[PDB]
UniProtKB/Swiss-Prot annotation:
EC number of this enzyme: 3.1.-.-
Function: Has endoribonuclease activity towards 23S and 16S rRNA (in vitro).
Name of this protein: Ribonuclease TTHA0252
Residues annotated for Zn(2+) 1 binding in this entry: H59, H61, H141, D162
GO-annotated biological processes: rRNA processing
Cofactor requirement: Zn(2+)
UniProt main location, coarse: cytoplasm
Transmembrane segments: none
UniProt record similarity statement: Belongs to the metallo-beta-lactamase superfamily. RNA-metabolizing metallo-beta-lactamase-like family.
Cystines in this chain: none
Binding site residues for Zn(2+) 2: D63, H64, D162, H400
Keywords: Cytoplasm, Endonuclease, Hydrolase, Metal-binding, Nuclease, RNA-binding, rRNA processing, Zinc
Keyword hit for Zinc: yes
Length: 431
């Protein structure tokens, strides 16, 4: 039994791992590369998409399912297993990536074909391929997110997929992995533990009351798949003490994803499921409004506060958010609230460096609005959480993370008596 890293090696995008065991070929995730690696979605997989017997998807994020339609474009016709939640989100994620893509490396025919082979596989349901047994464990990272347990040939392998930040309230805690002979694990934040959740929420509420009370705007860059709805959830459960103000989810996609949540009630934490039981959707704070088109979106720029605005892209690469930033950053009464990791050298970091001005949409804009970074809303397990999850596991191969971050984590694993390496592209490892 061998596992061959075919992406996310010494990097964060491109998650795709081929499992060779029991005389079968099972692909674990099939994400696209993103950002600077984006061009590599055009390059070949490094394996034959026709010899694959079946593929398992840990979750709907584009960096785990984005190359799936390419797998089908190039021949594959096997089954694609994923939890109902991932299956349903996957549709919104792929359609969108298609419509919003410069150099598309697949077409509508491939998305359709790909979605056509999705088969529901919930947690604790065993899959049988040859003499190989595979099951999903709770990863608590996205509704329907899971880690993979592959047992066969007398051995056990565990692919973590992306592990969640167990401190937040929306998703159920990540389950412990079973004792395994080999663990393929992410290490996005292998270099440090994250800021505590409760304290980030309090701080968040402090920021809201202050700027909303003075008639200012609270601008929030958010990814549309799950971070946006988590913010609305915090806004919903604390709406009793926040000043009245319209909440604009200025993101069609975030909207489509949100409309889907009521159907995924069983995929949330007990806290969230208990709210739905009371008969009320905890992801729709009072005053919520999903903005569908550009005209109303831009009208928000010249309208006065108080208001809360959630918009993408989550890392200021593009999206309506730039238009809000452009027109709101120069007003001292407004506040910018980052609820996620800002890439090095990006407009995010540049703003945090707090210069006298910033360049947004071909224009220099005075930066007077207050700026706040709430690291606590982070969606991946931090270093300390990675350690606990990995406790007692004999061997560990690291993927999904920048080199230095995988190393810092590697160090601690090593000093703990655990054997570890940094998965290399194309180089398989013995389970
Ligand atoms: Zn993810
Ligand atoms: Zn990922």
């Amino acid at each position: 039994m061998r596992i061959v890293p075919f992406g996310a090696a010494r990097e964060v995008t491109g998650s795709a791992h081929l499992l060779l065991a029991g005389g079968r070929r099972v692909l674990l995730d099939c994400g696209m590369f993103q950002g600077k690696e984006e061009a590599r979605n055009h390059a070949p997989f490094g394996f034959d998409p026709k010899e694959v017997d079946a593929v398992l998807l840990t979750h709907a994020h584009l960096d785990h399912v984005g190359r799936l339609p390419k797998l089908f474009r190039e021949g594959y016709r096997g089954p694609v297993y994923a939890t109902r939640a991932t299956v349903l989100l996957m549709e919104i994620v792929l359609e969108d990536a298609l419509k919003v893509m410069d150099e598309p490396f697949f077409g509508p025919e491939d998305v359709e074909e790909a979605l056509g082979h999705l088969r529901p596989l919930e947690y604790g349901e065993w899959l049988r391929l040859g003499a190989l047994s595979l099951a999903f464990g709770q990863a608590g990272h996205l509704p329907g997110s899971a880690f993979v347990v592959a047992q066969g040939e007398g051995r056990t392998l565990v692919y973590s997929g992306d592990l969640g930040n167990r401190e937040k309230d929306v998703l159920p805690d990540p389950s412990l992995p079973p004792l395994a002979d080999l663990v393929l694990a992410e290490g996005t934040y292998g270099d440090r533990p994250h800021r505590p959740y409760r304290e980030t929420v309090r701080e968040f509420l402090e920021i809201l009351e202050k700027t909303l009370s003075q008639g200012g705007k609270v601008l929030i860059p958010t990814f549309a798949v799950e971070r946006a709805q988590e913010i609305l959830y915090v806004l919903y459960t604390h709406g009793h003490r926040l000043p009245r103000a319209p909440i604009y989810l200025d993101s069609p996609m975030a909207g489509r994803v949100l409309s889907l949540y009521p159907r995924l009630v069983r995929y949330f934490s007990e806290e969230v499921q208990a709210h739905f039981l009371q008969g009320k959707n905890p992801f729709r704070p009072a005053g919520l409004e999903v903005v569908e088109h550009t005209e109303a979106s831009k009208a928000l720029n010249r309208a006065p506060g108080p208001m809360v605005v959630l918009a993408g892209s989550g890392m200021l690469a593009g999206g309506r958010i730039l238009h809000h930033l452009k027109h709101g950053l120069s007003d001292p009464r407004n506040a910018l609230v980052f609820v996620g990791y800002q890439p090095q050298g990006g407009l995010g970091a540049e703003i945090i460096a707090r210069p006298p001005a910033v360049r947004i949409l071909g224009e220099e804009v005075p930066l007077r609005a207050s700026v706040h970074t709430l690291g606590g809303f982070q969606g991946h397990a931090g270093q300390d959480e990675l350690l606990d999850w990995l406790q007692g596991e004999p061997r560990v191969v690291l993927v999904h993370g920048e080199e230095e971050k995988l190393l810092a984590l590697g160090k601690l694993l090593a000093l703990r008596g655990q054997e570890v390496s940094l998965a290399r592209f194309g180089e398989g490892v013995p389970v």
